[PDB]
Amino acid sequence: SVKDEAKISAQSFYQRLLLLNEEAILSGQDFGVRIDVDTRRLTFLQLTADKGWQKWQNDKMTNQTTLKEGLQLDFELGGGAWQKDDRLFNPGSLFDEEMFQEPAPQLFVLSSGEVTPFTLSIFPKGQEPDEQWRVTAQENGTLRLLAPG
Amino acid sequence: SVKDEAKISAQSFYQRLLLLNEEAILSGQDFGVRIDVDTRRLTFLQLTADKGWQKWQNDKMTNQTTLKEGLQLDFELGGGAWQDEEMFADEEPAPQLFVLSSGEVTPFTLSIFPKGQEPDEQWRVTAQENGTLRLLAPGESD
Numbered sequence: 001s002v003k004d005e006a007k008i009s010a011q012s013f014y015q016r017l018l019l020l021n022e023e024a025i026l027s028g029q030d031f032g033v034r035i036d037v038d039t040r041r042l043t044f045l046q047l048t049a050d051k052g053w054q055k056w057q058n059d060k061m062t063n064q065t066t067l068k069e070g071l072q073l074d075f076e077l078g079g080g081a082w083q084k085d086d087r088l089f090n091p092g093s094l095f096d097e098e099m100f101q102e103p104a105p106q107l108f109v110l111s112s113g114e115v116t117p118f119t120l121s122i123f124p125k126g127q128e129p130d131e132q133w134r135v136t137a138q139e140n141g142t143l144r145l146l147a148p149g
Numbered sequence: 150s151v152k153d154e155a156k157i158s159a160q161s162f163y164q165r166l167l168l169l170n171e172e173a174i175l176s177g178q179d180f181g182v183r184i185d186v187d188t189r190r191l192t193f194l195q196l197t198a199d200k201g202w203q204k205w206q207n208d209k210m211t212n213q214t215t216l217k218e219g220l221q222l223d224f225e226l227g228g229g230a231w232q233d234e235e236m237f238a239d240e241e242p243a244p245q246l247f248v249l250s251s252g253e254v255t256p257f258t259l260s261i262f263p264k265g266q267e268p269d270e271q272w273r274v275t276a277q278e279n280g281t282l283r284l285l286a287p288g289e290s291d
């Protein structure tokens with residue numbers, strides 16, 4: 001069911017975030033996660049001096065995931081408000097093609113082991129983001145997967 | 150004169166960039182420079198997890214340079230071309246130049262020159278693909 005999907009999607013994010021935190025610490029390089037609430041996408045990025053933020057091409061994990069239809073995602077930075085607006089959809093984000101330089105991650109996963117404080121929640125369409133399957137960090141890199149409630 | 154000012158500014162940016170790279174390496178933290186061509190500003194930033202890029206508050210160098218009004222700046226990257234009231238009282242743009250803890254610096258050239266001249270072959274600071282940082286006088290070096 002969609003609730004079962006939400007769990008699996010939260011475990012997938014947790015595993016990927018842990019992996020990137022581990023990669024940063026072992027490699028001395030900085031990584032990041034870009035969350036796109038309107039397209040329900042998470043992209044896993046590496047910072048290089050010569051090309052800035054790029055998708056991380058690697059032999060451990062895919063670098064972009066998109067939620068299955070029927071799931072939503074949302075996120076908070078630090079103590080702040082949920083990021084997603086109330087619209088059912090962003091009229092501009094429906095278009096696969098440009099209508100009118102990899103965008104920077106909101107979550108930094110630094111070589112020091114520090115991670116941007118945040119909460120990402122994943123939940124069935126029709127529900128609010130609060131008290132859902134969620135992954136949270138704090139600044140020191142401590143990271144939690146939390147069940148609804 | 151304005152040409153003497155260009156030199157002094159180029160020399161100062163080299164010194165500040167060298168310190169930033171040295172600090173990145175020594176400290177394991179990431180830094181960067183943001184260049185604002187229109188306003189003639191160079192801003193020296195630090196990457197933190199919790200606040201992203203922010204001005205580098207430190208006790209050794211200033212973290213924002215604004216060139217004197219008779220001067221102009223431009224930069225190229227690698228082989229590219231020249232570039233409300235609150236209800237209760239108690240209710241940073243990214244750098245183009247990354248100065249990473251690995252010691253690597255975004256390949257670039259910044260040139261500083263009297264207002265309205267061409268940016269080529271001016272007092273300049275370059276970070277080459279090699280890793281090296283160079284201060285170069287006007288004209289092509291030997």
Ligand SMILES: [Cl-]
Pocket residue numbers: 161162165191214
């Ligand atoms: Cl400077």
Ligand code: NA
Pocket residue numbers: 034035036041042043
């Ligand atoms: Na994304």
Ligand code: NA
Pocket residue numbers: 053054055102
């Ligand atoms: Na990319």
